[PDB]
Amino acid sequence: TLNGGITDMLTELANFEKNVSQAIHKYNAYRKAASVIAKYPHKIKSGAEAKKLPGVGTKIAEKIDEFLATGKLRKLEKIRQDDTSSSINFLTRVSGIGPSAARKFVDEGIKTLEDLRKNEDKLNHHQRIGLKYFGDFEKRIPREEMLQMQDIVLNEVKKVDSEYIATVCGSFRRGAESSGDMDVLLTHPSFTSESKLLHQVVEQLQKVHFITDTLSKGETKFMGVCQLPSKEKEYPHRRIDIRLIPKDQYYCGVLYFTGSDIFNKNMKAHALEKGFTINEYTIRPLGVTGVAGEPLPVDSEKDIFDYIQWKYREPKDRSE
DNA sequence: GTCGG
DNA sequence: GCTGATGCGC
DNA sequence: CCGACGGCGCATCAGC
Ligand SMILES: Nc1ccn([C@H]2C[C@H](O)[C@@H](COP(=O)(O)C(F)(F)P(=O)(O)OP(=O)(O)O)O2)c(=O)n1
Ligand SMILES: [Mn+2]
Ligand SMILES: [Mn+2]
Ligand code: NA
Ligand code: NA
């Protein structure tokens, strides 16, 4: 991109903190820095130039000073050569293996994809599936195939009950040309905030062999593996997430699920300021005393915007 | 790690 | 066996 | 200077 070099650096440091240091807030800091610099209209000639930006503090300015001067970062090269930090990092690339388990595996001597193979017995179902499709889960999904996948899920859903509304959200709804996975928001007239619709839909998607494995399943959330039908050669296996939301709560749901995650954090933060609390369900009033007010009436994504005083931004403009 | 309080 | 911590992920 | 830093769903297993 533009400052890609800098943002790649910050992103690699973020991962290290989350995975090796288990310092989630420094993970978040580094991604906020990366976020702000990514949307900066000029070419960063210096660390000080960057330090003008909110989220970019003293330490990052130095690192950026070094990066621009040296073209690399000693902190990072130190990290790539530390066997342990390198091993822990790689392992978290398996779905279902986080910092804690990656760290445990390494202290046990399990530190490569082959070692996980030998040790399948020590992995939970989710991890086993993470290994099974390790390579495929790292492949991006070209929009074209997204549109295919969409047609398959919308049709199958309609073919369980026509009152279902399924909306593909996430980077797809933001307009990305390739996505990491597919995210589907599901609604139905019989399920509101007042009121087993997800199983029905998951079962149907299984019987046409679109959904190939399950990572988790609940009253409202399904995380699993899917695959476009082949002919020719097989498509890679893809992650799919389905989320059942109550009808009258569809607009918060789809604002949430559309993201991005950084946008969601920034919005949810800049609202608590305006005296509101936005979660994936409602946008409640923040009372003076200390408790959240009742759910405010919503009929649009814009309503949530209007509610806190943020001039609208199309899904395509929420990619932070 | 950063920035408002 | 049950369940609250904890982990992983959206 | 210090400390808060968005909000929530499901699965697992240590410790009774
Ligand atoms: N920490 C998080 C993570 C996610 N989300 C919401 C906001 C997201 O829009 C939505 C999907 O998260 P996703 O895990 O599929 C994602 F982020 F990767 P996506 O944006 O979809 O881009 P892609 O999948 O191509 O990589 O959950 C959130 O609110 N908080
Ligand atoms: Mn996604
Ligand atoms: Mn997803
Ligand atoms: Na700054
Ligand atoms: Na992982």
| Domain that includes residue A227, residue range | 140-256
- Tally of domains in chain A: 4
User: Could you tell which of A261, A263, A320 is best to mutate to test the pocket of ligand 1, judged by most ligand atoms within 8 Å of the CB?
Assistant: A261
Judged by C1' against the alpha carbon of A56, the nearest nucleotide is B2
Give, using CA atoms, the residue closest to atom 8 of ligand 1: A259
CB-based contact A52:A58 (threshold 8 Å): no
A63 is annotated as an active-site residue: yes
Experimental method: X-ray
Residue entry with tokens 């009121």: A195
A241 and A149 both lie in a single domain = yes
> Rounded distance, CA A276 to CA A228, Å?
42
Count of Cβ atoms closer than 10 Å to residue A167 Cβ: 19
A280-289 long-range contacts (CB < 8 A, ≥24 apart) are A280/A245, A280/A252, A280/A253, A280/A256, A281/A193, A281/A245, A281/A246, A281/A249, A281/A252, A281/A253, A282/A249, A282/A252, A283/A252, A283/A307, A283/A308
> Rounded distance, CA A249 to CA A185, Å?
11
CB-based contact A169:A258 (threshold 8 Å): yes
Residue A260: is the preceding peptide bond cis (ω within 30°)?
Answer: yes
> Rounded distance, CA A47 to CA A54, Å?
13
A64 and A44 both lie in a single domain = yes
> Rounded distance, CA A80 to CA A85, Å?
7
Residue entry with tokens 């990072």: A76
- Residue A45's identity, in one-letter code, is K
CATH of the domain at A315: 3.30.210.10
Among the listed residues A228, A252, A248, the one whose alpha carbon sits nearest the alpha carbon of residue A240: A228
Among the listed residues A309, A275, A304, the one whose alpha carbon sits nearest the alpha carbon of residue A289: A275
- Residue A121's identity, in one-letter code, is D
> Rounded distance, CA A225 to CA A212, Å?
5
A76 and A5 both lie in a single domain = yes
Q: Is A260 in the pocket of ligand 1 (CB under 6 A)?
A: yes
A109 and A54 both lie in a single domain = no
Q: Which of A63, A118, A132, A139 is catalytic?
A: A63
CATH of the domain at A227: 3.30.460.10
| Phi, psi of A301, deg, nearest 5 | -65, -40
Q: Check whether residue A238 has its CB closer than 7 Å to nucleic acid strand C.
A: no
A105 and A203 both lie in a single domain = no
Output the CA A139–ligand 5 centroid distance in Å.
15
Q: Return the biggest CA–CA distance within chain A.
A: 64
